[PDB]
Each structure stands twice: as C-alpha cells, then as structure tokens.
A paper describes a structure:
Thus, we recombinantly expressed a truncated PRV gB protein, denoted as PRV gB-D_IV, which includes the domain IV and a portion of the adjacent domain III central helix. Based on the ELISA experiments, all the 14 complement-dependent neutralizing antibodies can bind to both gB and gB-D_IV, indicating the epitopes of these antibodies are very probably within the domain IV of gB. In order to further characterize the immunogenic properties of PRV gB and identify the epitopes of these neutralizing antibodies, we determined the crystal structures of PRV gB and gB-D_IV at 3.1 and 2.7 Å resolution, respectively. Domain IV wraps around the top of the central helix bundle to form a crown in the bottle-shaped gB trimer. The trimerization interfaces are highly stable, such that the truncated gB-D_IV could also assemble into trimers. The structure of gB-D_IV trimer could be ideally superimposed with the corresponding portion in the context of the entire gB ectodomain, with a rmsd of 0.598 Å. The highly stable structure of gB-D_IV further supported the conclusion from our ELISA based assays that these complement-dependent neutralizing antibodies target the crown region of PRV gB and very probably within domain IV. Based on the gB structure we present in this study, domain IV is located on the apexes of the gB trimer to form a "crown", making it fully accessible for both antibody and potential receptor recognition. However, all the antibodies targeting domain IV of gB reported to date do not directly block PRV entry but dependent on the complement effect instead, as shown by cell-based assays in vitro. This phenomenon implies that domain IV is probably not a receptor binding site for PRV gB, and that it might retain the same fold before and after membrane fusion with only domain rearrangement in the process of gB conformational changes to mediate membrane fusion.
Numbering used by the authors:
A (entry chain B): 64 to 87, 489 to 574, 581 to 639
B (entry chain A): 65 to 86, 489 to 641
C (entry chain C): 64 to 87, 489 to 641
Write the structure that this text describes.
Amino acid sequence: DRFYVCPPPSGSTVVRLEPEQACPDMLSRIAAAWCELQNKDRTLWGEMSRLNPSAVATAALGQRVSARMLGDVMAISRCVEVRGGVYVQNSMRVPGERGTCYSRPLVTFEIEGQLGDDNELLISRDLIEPCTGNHRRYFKLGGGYVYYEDYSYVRMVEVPETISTRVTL
Amino acid sequence: RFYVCPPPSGSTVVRLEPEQACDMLSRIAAAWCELQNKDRTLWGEMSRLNPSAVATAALGQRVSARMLGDVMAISRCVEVRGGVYVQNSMRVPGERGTCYSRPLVTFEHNGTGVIEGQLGDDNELLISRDLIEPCTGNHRRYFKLGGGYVYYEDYSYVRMVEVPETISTRVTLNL
Amino acid sequence: DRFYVCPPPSGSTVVRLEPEQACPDMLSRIAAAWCELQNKDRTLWGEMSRLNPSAVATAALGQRVSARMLGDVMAISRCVEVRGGVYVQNSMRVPGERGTCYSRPLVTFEHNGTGVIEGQLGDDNELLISRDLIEPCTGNHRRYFKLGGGYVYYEDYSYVRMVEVPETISTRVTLNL
C-alpha cells in the first residue's frame, strides 16, 4: 500500500461528526434496526474521535486525512502520496543518548523522518522510548513488514497469518 | 438541552448484557446476531474509560455512571432549566501557566441555588471546576454549546459560531 | 463461565488484523451496505487492538487467546482452562506498604503444567499468575469482581459476600424476522 505524508491541520477547515439520525415488512424492521445500529455506533465513533481523530476522519471521508481536535470540533488536512522510494534505516537507537531509542523505524524519503502508523511518513524523528531487552518489533512498511531486533534492522518479513473481526453474510 | 449529572450511588447496580446464543432472512438474522456478539467487546472496552457514554447509549436517556470493579453504578441526569452565563476568560485567576481546558459557566436550579461550574461534553454542565491544562500559544478551541459552538482564541471568548460541515461514518441503506 | 490461564505470547505466532475488502435490487442494497459496514467497522477494531489486543483476538477467533503487540502485528497465545478449585483471599490490602492495594482479588489455584500458583483474578474470568495490579487505597471503597458465574463483593479492601447481579443493561439492537 501507498505512503503518505500528513500536512498539519490549520484552523481553517473545521468540521464535526454527523450527529445521531432520526429513525423512520421484513424490509422495514431491518431498516429501522440498521438505523438504531448506526446511531448507537456513533457513540463508539465519538470516543475514537477524541483520541484518534485522524483515523475517524479517514474512514468517514474515504481518503487519507490528518486530523486534530480543537476542543469539540475537528480540523482536517488532506494527506499526500509519496511516489518515491522509501528507505528504512538500520539502527533505531538515538545517536546522542544511550537507554533511549526511536519507538518506530527511521526512514529517508523524497528528507529525514520516521515510520508512523499505517504507512504514514513523518518528518519529525521524535517518537522515542527507553530501550528494552528482547526488543522485537514488526513494522508495516508499504506492502510488507520489516522486522527489528534489539533496535537493529534484520529483514523484511511477510506475515501471512490473519485474524478477522468481520461478520460473514 | 443542558444537563447536570448527580454522582451515582451504590444503590442500583447493573452490568453489560453478555454475548448471546445465536432463508435469506435467516442468514441475515444470524449475521445480525453475530455482529451484535462481536460489537459487544467494543462496548465492553469503552465502558472502562467512559461508562457514562456507554450507559446513556444503551439506556436512551442521558445518564452518568462509574465502574465499581466490573459492575456499573448509575444515576439519571437532571435536565437544566434556565439561563447560563459563559465566562469570557479561560485563564485560572490563581496562577499563570495554568488555565481551564473547557469554558467556565454559571447557571442555577433545583436543590439548591446558583452553581459556578464548567462546560462538559455533549452539553453537560459540571459543578467541579478542575479541568485544567498549562497555557499554550496560538491556542484555538471550539466548544459545543447548546445547538451551536463557542469560539475561543488564546484563552478568551471571541464569538458564537456554527458548523454546517458534517462528517459521517454512518452507512446508508435505501430500501 | 469457566476459568483461564494465559501463557505469555512469545512471537512464535504473529498475526495481523485482516484488511478491508473491495465491495460488490433490494437484497443487493443490503449486502453492499453490510460490506461497507464491516469495512468502516475495521477502524474501530484497529484502534482497540492497540489497548486490548487480547480481547480483539479472542473475539476474532471465537476462543480465549491472549495477545500483545510487537510493533504493528499481534503475538497470539491460546489460553488454557483451569479446572481445580480456587481459594479467594479476604484482603485486597497489600502486605508490604500501607496505603497501597490490589485492585483485583488475590486467588490461589492449581494448574496441570505448573503446580500451585499464587495469583490474581483478572478480566472475564482470566486467572493471572502475577499479583501486581496495584492501586492506592481509598475510603468509601466498593468493588464487584466477576468470579465464575457470579460476582464477589468487596468493601474497604476485604471480602463480604457472593452477590448475584440480575440487573442488565444492553447496547444490542434487536432484529426480529
């Protein structure tokens, strides 16, 4: 899948989450339940907007967007594809400090940033954690995954095993 | 509307209904069942951070709630009757650096008298004024207030606004 | 329901949450929206999998598993039934320091792999071998923990009685056909 950078949301585009919607023979009990379902779910969507507004808004608009909460309202900025080659960097240790490492891999792309959630590329290399033993991480990188051990790069891996929360109809 | 939330007591205690035992309208019915079983886990996880919002959704009436271990304490929320005064400055008078996360309000009714509290989520008026955060530059906020929203640049009131711009995760089913 | 121990997931089995799928007159309008609904829904599961991957995994599989993140992927390990009896401690007060307390009850139970484990009641009837879920103490302290098919009641950090909570609240949407 594609790489995006996410431009900071300005206080310009301000939107909110579509409120609960009023609700209206076996094609009719289904329609009302479907409505009541959608309404109730909005409470879950509400809670997520608080913490992960970006991901609530991408799902809502069907496009890659960045978001921040400015209180009780959302500030939307469109994301941009990175056509280039992206390159991951061997170490994940911070060259100026010991006992601190980047929590996610460093990359360079066409600038010196680091890998975010779901193939987002950041410019800010500032996701850091205290270092650990048995440090093992798999990071989604484009179509595949890249594996790290003791914060030193190891290999690109496939992860075929899959778990699902879909309901089959 | 507006609401005050009394603190729930250990009087009536409830819990989330557990997962349930489960031609085309039959498979659909089955999927519908399973979907409810699966969503159940989403509701459970939220009920720990925000039991209130879980309860009110499940109840149909604005309620408040707290977790007592794995069980939930409830109280109905009182509907606010009367005018409201929104303060203009969200800076705490007591200290520099620290301010209010949401706008202060004064309103009044029921037992017993005028309350100096603050604006909560989803048009809940709080009594406790403790929603505190250190000051930041270029600090824009909006806060839901009744139907519309109240704008706030660098920690003080500007104007009343609106938001025609609606974003939906809702899914449509036109039968 | 039944009790469960949960071995720590080594990265031996590592999984990912299955991606969204491309979506295909009145019956069609449904399966379409049903598919768009699962698609949308996946963002919620993506989120939860970040705080409680164990619960995301057990819902997915239909069995009690315990998970932990290793980056953007889930280490899975299948949980095992505990079958012997169980001793519940009366006092959720921690022995070492005043003011510090367990936030879930202490249990002792016996396993088949290892022997007697001095553990602790956890969510949805899981038994943990650790005894380190620790909050500070409080007055006015009332808790109800899920234990077997009932709930056990504690006041001021010490056992009281075996309650039942008949009272139920629900987010379910009924559909009758």
